[PDB]
Design a protein around this nucleic acid. Sequence first.
RNA 1: GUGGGAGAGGGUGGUGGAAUUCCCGGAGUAGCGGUGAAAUGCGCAGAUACCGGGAGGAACGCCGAUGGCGAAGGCAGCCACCUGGUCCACCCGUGACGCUGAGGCGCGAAAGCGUGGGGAGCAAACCGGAUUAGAUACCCGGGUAGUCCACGCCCUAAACGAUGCGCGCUAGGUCUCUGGGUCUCCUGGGGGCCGAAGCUAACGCGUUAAGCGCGCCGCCUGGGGAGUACGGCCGCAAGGC
Lengths: 101, 88, 73, 119
Amino acid sequence: MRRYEVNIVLNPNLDQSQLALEKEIIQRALENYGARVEKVEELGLRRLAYPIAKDPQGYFLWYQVEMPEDRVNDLARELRIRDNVRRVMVVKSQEPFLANA
Amino acid sequence: PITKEEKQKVIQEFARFPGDTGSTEVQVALLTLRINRLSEHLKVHKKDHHSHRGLLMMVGQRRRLLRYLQREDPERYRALIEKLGIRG
Amino acid sequence: PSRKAKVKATLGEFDLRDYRNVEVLKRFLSETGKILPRRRTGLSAKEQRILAKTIKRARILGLLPFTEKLVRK
Amino acid sequence: KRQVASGRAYIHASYNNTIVTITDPDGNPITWSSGGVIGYKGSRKGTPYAAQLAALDAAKKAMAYGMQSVDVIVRGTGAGREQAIRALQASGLQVKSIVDDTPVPHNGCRPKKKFRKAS
RNA sequence: GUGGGAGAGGGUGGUGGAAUUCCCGGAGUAGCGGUGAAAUGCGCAGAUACCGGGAGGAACGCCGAUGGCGAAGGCAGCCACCUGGUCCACCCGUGACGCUGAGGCGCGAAAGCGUGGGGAGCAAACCGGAUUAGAUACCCGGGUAGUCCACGCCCUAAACGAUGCGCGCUAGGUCUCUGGGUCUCCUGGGGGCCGAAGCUAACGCGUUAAGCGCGCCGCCUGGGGAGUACGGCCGCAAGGC
Ligand SMILES: [K+]
Ligand SMILES: [K+]
Ligand SMILES: [K+]
Ligand SMILES: [Mg+2]
Ligand SMILES: [Mg+2]
Ligand SMILES: [Mg+2]
Ligand SMILES: [Mg+2]
Ligand SMILES: [Mg+2]
Ligand SMILES: [Mg+2]
Ligand SMILES: [Mg+2]
Ligand SMILES: [Mg+2]
Ligand SMILES: [Mg+2]
Ligand SMILES: [Mg+2]
Ligand SMILES: [Mg+2]
Ligand SMILES: [Mg+2]
Ligand SMILES: [Mg+2]
Ligand SMILES: [Mg+2]
Ligand SMILES: [Mg+2]
Ligand SMILES: [Mg+2]
Ligand SMILES: [Mg+2]
Ligand SMILES: [Mg+2]
Ligand SMILES: [Mg+2]
Ligand SMILES: [Mg+2]
Ligand SMILES: [Mg+2]
Ligand SMILES: [Mg+2]
Ligand SMILES: [Mg+2]
Ligand SMILES: [Mg+2]
Ligand SMILES: [Mg+2]
Ligand SMILES: [Mg+2]
Ligand SMILES: [Mg+2]
Ligand SMILES: [Mg+2]
Ligand SMILES: [Mg+2]
Ligand SMILES: [Mg+2]
Ligand SMILES: [Mg+2]
Ligand SMILES: [Mg+2]
Ligand SMILES: [Mg+2]
Ligand SMILES: [Mg+2]
Ligand SMILES: [Mg+2]
Ligand SMILES: [Mg+2]
Ligand SMILES: [Mg+2]
Ligand SMILES: [Mg+2]
Ligand SMILES: [Mg+2]
Ligand SMILES: [Mg+2]
Ligand SMILES: [Mg+2]
Ligand SMILES: [Mg+2]
Ligand SMILES: [Mg+2]
Ligand SMILES: [Mg+2]
Ligand SMILES: [Mg+2]
Ligand SMILES: [Mg+2]
Ligand SMILES: [Mg+2]
């Protein structure tokens, strides 16, 4: 049971129904791997620094969760099946390292 | 890995007395736990030799501590081996 | 000798491990998408080491560029 | 005969030749030139003067299509890059922006023995 | 033991962008390439240069360093998992449990071998073009094994600090990595430079000793013959000891 952070960049051209469906599949996959969510920050469409999937923008989602380690990788795979989901990055949570303090 | 609760469990299980954290029995029990963990890790990932070296070193340390116990008090030596099931 | 300004001294309180803060990591890149050296950023060894990996994460996420183009040559 | 009136200008400058390709704002070429399109045949193409002649010839060919402003793009380190730049700059063609876009790898492929002692 | 720390230490899976090549399309025309100069080569079956899309293999630009890790070989995109070593603080526990190490066992760059796969770039051999008195070369155009992966062999090296391991003792200054602390600085571990005493044939070494000592292992005894012969052991072979 470790604490992780999930960054999900998906198709910004999705309507509200398709976005709701993708987020529903994300929530269902999180439940299926026992990933207890602590908070969420939906940033939404933002301008990329380089085209991803031939699109200059991307819809960003971020979830701080806690889950068993053994299946973390096995979860990321499940999140890459959806074609609308184009970037999935999971990172072990770390305490902030402040500079110029 | 090897969390703190398992470490304290084996320490309290092999402590010669309440408060003992560094007797020969405790050291050998902890080395045995680490050795079994590393052997389970080395069944898979058999191409990992740098950890194989650490396994060799842990085994050598455990053998030297068991040799010391054998020399000093063979009764606790036999008791330790009976509790942990070592030497085959 | 890079006597213009240091990126750290031209900045305030910020997290070095936040890979999502794009507007602050943009300052640590050159005119190209390259990562600035120590003489330009004014960071310490450990600080620069953390900044490198956080910038690489921000690049993979699509927030920072891997490489840009030079203008006014 | 398209009357583009504004486009891009790519300059490929190597140590052996300099070649200029004038394109539309989408990159599709219109005309072009090089040291070989001028009378120069051998090593004389890797000359800054040859690059100047190539740039001026490509510019005059683009004049037939009635082009006035260009965006210059430089690729490659070779003698004659700056000479082609200065040739296009004062040629009737308004140079809007000069950009170096030389393709540098991230240490992907192994060079020939000529370019070794590096990666 | 407890609590902290840094790291390209290792293994497995996944994943990102730049570039090379190739394929498709667009656009476009007479050469590109290459060299001291050239030629082979490729190009009217449309190349080079440009834009877009796709495939594949390999290596990770900046960060990056005189830096870090490892016993050595060696390790450099990113993420996760598994895992080794190590350092510091507390002064908590065991109570000499230590050092070294003939054999043995295991690891061991590259090249090389076997089976299967892969094959973009590079490239022994080889096919050509040049050069040259000749050119079985350097230079140029191609190009196979190989380089890559899995598994199994092979045991070599300028495997280098040309300096075996451990412990103690013997001025300092300066730069740096990493902790701790009353955080001008002190203290501990590691990486460099200059230097006290001393050592050295000298160059140089000098708290990271090549100084002063102690313990244990390895090795040397003029050069060629020769790391050859014979014998043995190991190896599929090349061959190694
Ligand atoms: K080093
Ligand atoms: K073959
Ligand atoms: K400090
Ligand atoms: Mg997908
Ligand atoms: Mg030429
Ligand atoms: Mg590592
Ligand atoms: Mg074509
Ligand atoms: Mg060719
Ligand atoms: Mg060819
Ligand atoms: Mg021909
Ligand atoms: Mg024709
Ligand atoms: Mg091409
Ligand atoms: Mg293309
Ligand atoms: Mg292929
Ligand atoms: Mg560098
Ligand atoms: Mg080290
Ligand atoms: Mg080395
Ligand atoms: Mg005490
Ligand atoms: Mg006592
Ligand atoms: Mg030893
Ligand atoms: Mg031995
Ligand atoms: Mg080997
Ligand atoms: Mg090999
Ligand atoms: Mg082979
Ligand atoms: Mg084969
Ligand atoms: Mg080749
Ligand atoms: Mg060749
Ligand atoms: Mg030849
Ligand atoms: Mg001669
Ligand atoms: Mg002749
Ligand atoms: Mg081929
Ligand atoms: Mg063969
Ligand atoms: Mg050396
Ligand atoms: Mg040596
Ligand atoms: Mg000698
Ligand atoms: Mg030494
Ligand atoms: Mg020191
Ligand atoms: Mg000195
Ligand atoms: Mg003296
Ligand atoms: Mg002297
Ligand atoms: Mg010493
Ligand atoms: Mg002799
Ligand atoms: Mg003799
Ligand atoms: Mg000899
Ligand atoms: Mg030999
Ligand atoms: Mg021999
Ligand atoms: Mg023999
Ligand atoms: Mg035999
Ligand atoms: Mg032979
Ligand atoms: Mg032979």
